[PDB]
């Protein structure tokens, strides 16, 4: 589906204008989509500064783009309801040079188009092009492609589909609005010569005996064991016992020796391109409650030698023995190495140890709040329609309190989750401005893969607004101070606002695909941050 003529190719970074007929929500959503491109490809974007061809993003009727670089500068429309990651990425892929997936020359081998069902004026989105105009980039037809239409697209009748897969199973798969497919990234890389990406700095799964180039220190007392996943119940996080003799984690036993013994596992040297990074990993602590996992940085002391230590975070064992996710913010502006110190406490009271797998390091912020729901595949069966779960309270950088509500069986839409955001009372409320006004919420359901290029995390975006009001609170703003417009909960001593979000956030069948439920538990990320400065 890529335009063949090389004079249609951009030279990076692509200069952009965000126009003031966009709302703040749309500007923030576009900048969030540019971060996803920089994180999964070598595509890059810059503010305009006066250049020959450029993309101007505007609000007109519907979502659309011209295809490929137009040398006089071009327009990308993001209308009402278009301001979602997957939709912005679809229009930017048009500007980069891609037509819809159903427009491939071979498409009649894979899908049926029902022409008399298409609403007038939209039919060109179902055209197919000759191989003189379009390349396949030597890739097969991808039903999972972000560039493929859903069955009920531009249909005259709500019951009859416009496009259907010839093999009938894929009717449930085509038209996904998660993220780029693997084949979409391969096509993008083949078109633009991307061998790397601007923002994935390191990742590790411990699956090769090289342990991702990690080294073990000798100023410590002991070593981490590279561990085989063969022993009963000792499964690795990357594969959870799926493949025999082939899943690997790092282990530090705490059941023997002296208290306060330690082991250092230390990364290879890294060269950061930005001022901030996020280190994500999975761990367990089945040992003593006094065992510790500590994360450290070792960095250039400005002589060019990596020696200076900084302690960044500490983790400890609660009563939960299943795998946990962790995020650590790093602020490294010179070359460095990230380090794990495992430490024993009370070895005569430990029958276990510390475990590590699935490290990822990105030159991004960390998620502001993270919620894990355990046994979700069982929660989904044991919960009536309109029953709910609620997250613990999180806090912004700005100090606002917030949380999320999950209704596992949406009474508003059967066969979907309903996931929604609320503002919580917190210790800061007296000094914060109310209503919260132009703060953008991003909710993400993590696709649990260690390489970010394999992740199709579902995500939704909205901006808190003075127009968000409810009859339940005498038609006042939902985002006013939670002590006057929320309801008290004994679960955290919080007042929680009325919630706003999506019935139909994700379907139960989509949630059982990919790695959304990897260990039969569900990981939701949330961010809540000011975007007023984009005005
Ligand atoms: C010695 O170890 C015990 C038990 O620890 C358990 O068994 C070990 C072999 C390991 O497998 C451990 O991972 C495992 O937890 C310690 O008992 C623990 O003590 C803490 C503190 O009292 C308990 O936490 C409390 O839990 C209650 C609710 O039950 C809360 O209300 C409290 O606020 C607090 O969180 C923990 O439940 C308890 N664990 C168990 C399963 O008994 C013991 O303290 C430890 N002693 C020493 C000297 O370190
Ligand atoms: C992005 O889209 C907008 C809207 O399509 C483009 O602005 C448009 O520019 C054209 C060409 O100048 C305008 O056409 C002219 O309109 C005047 C009357 O306004 C008429 O006298 C001329 O004969 C001609 O038809 C068009 O009206 C104008 N639309 C608006 C609303 O301003 C814009 O150029 C596009 N930008 C890029 C870089 O693609
Ligand atoms: C991505 O990498 C490929 C492979 O290096 C680039 O394709 C190559 O592009 C150059 C021009 O930069 C081509 O050279 C030109 O060839 C034409 C005749 O085909 C000639 O008329 C020109 O004077 C010039 O010599 C080269 O042939 C071409 N090779 C292939 C395999 O197509 C491609 O441009 C890169 N794309 C980018 C910039 O992302
Ligand atoms: C939209 O499509 C549905 C399904 O084809 C149509 O409903 C059928 O209409 C025929 C003729 O009236 C009935 O014999 C069937 O029993 C109907 N089936 C269902 C599922 O109701 C519907 O009429 C179409 N609507 C439009 C706008 O033509
Ligand atoms: C999720 O469900 C599993 C399976 O029911 C729970 O694991 C069992 O937990 C009970 C009570 O601790 C034990 O007696 C069983 O032996 C466990 N079975 C297995 C397969 O391990 C698990 O505890 C549940 N987790 C949560 C957090 O609810
Ligand atoms: C809304 O109005 C009713 C009737 O005046 C009153 O009883 C109730 O307390 C009001 N609630 C709020 C949110 O002020
Ligand atoms: Ca050592
Ligand atoms: Ca592993
Ligand atoms: Zn499109």
Numbering used by the authors: 66 to 600
Manuscript excerpt for this entry:
The zinc-dependent metalloprotease meprin α is predominantly expressed in the brush border membrane of proximal tubules in the kidney and enterocytes in the small intestine and colon. In normal tissue homeostasis meprin α performs key roles in inflammation, immunity, and extracellular matrix remodelling. In contrast to meprin β, meprin α is secreted into the extracellular space, whereupon it oligomerises to form giant assemblies and is the largest extracellular protease identified to date (~6 MDa). Here, using cryo-electron microscopy, we determine the high-resolution structure of the zymogen and mature form of meprin α, as well as the structure of the active form in complex with a prototype small molecule inhibitor and human fetuin-B. Our data reveal that meprin α forms a giant, flexible, left-handed helical assembly of roughly 22 nm in diameter.
Activation of the zymogen was accomplished by way of magnetic trypsin beads. These enabled the cleavage of the pro-peptide and facilitated subsequent removal of trypsin without further dilution of the protein sample by additional purification steps. Comparison between the cryo-EM reconstructions of the latent and activated states reveal subtle conformational changes about the M12A catalytic domain. Accordingly, the steric occlusion of the active site represents the major autoinhibitory mechanism. Upon activation, the two lobes of the M12A catalytic domain collapse around the active site (RMSD 3.3 Å), permitting the formation of a more tightly folded active site core. Upon proteolytic cleavage of the pro-peptide the active is exposed and the M12A protease domain undergoes a conformational relaxation. The exposed active site defines a deep pocket that positions the catalytic glutamic acid in close proximity to the substrate peptide as described for meprin β56. The subunit is a compact triad comprising the globular M12A protease, MAM and MATH domains. The meprin α M12A domain is typical, containing the catalytic zinc ion within the active site. For all variants, the zymogen form was roughly 6 kDa higher in mass than the activated counterpart consistent with the removal of the propeptide.
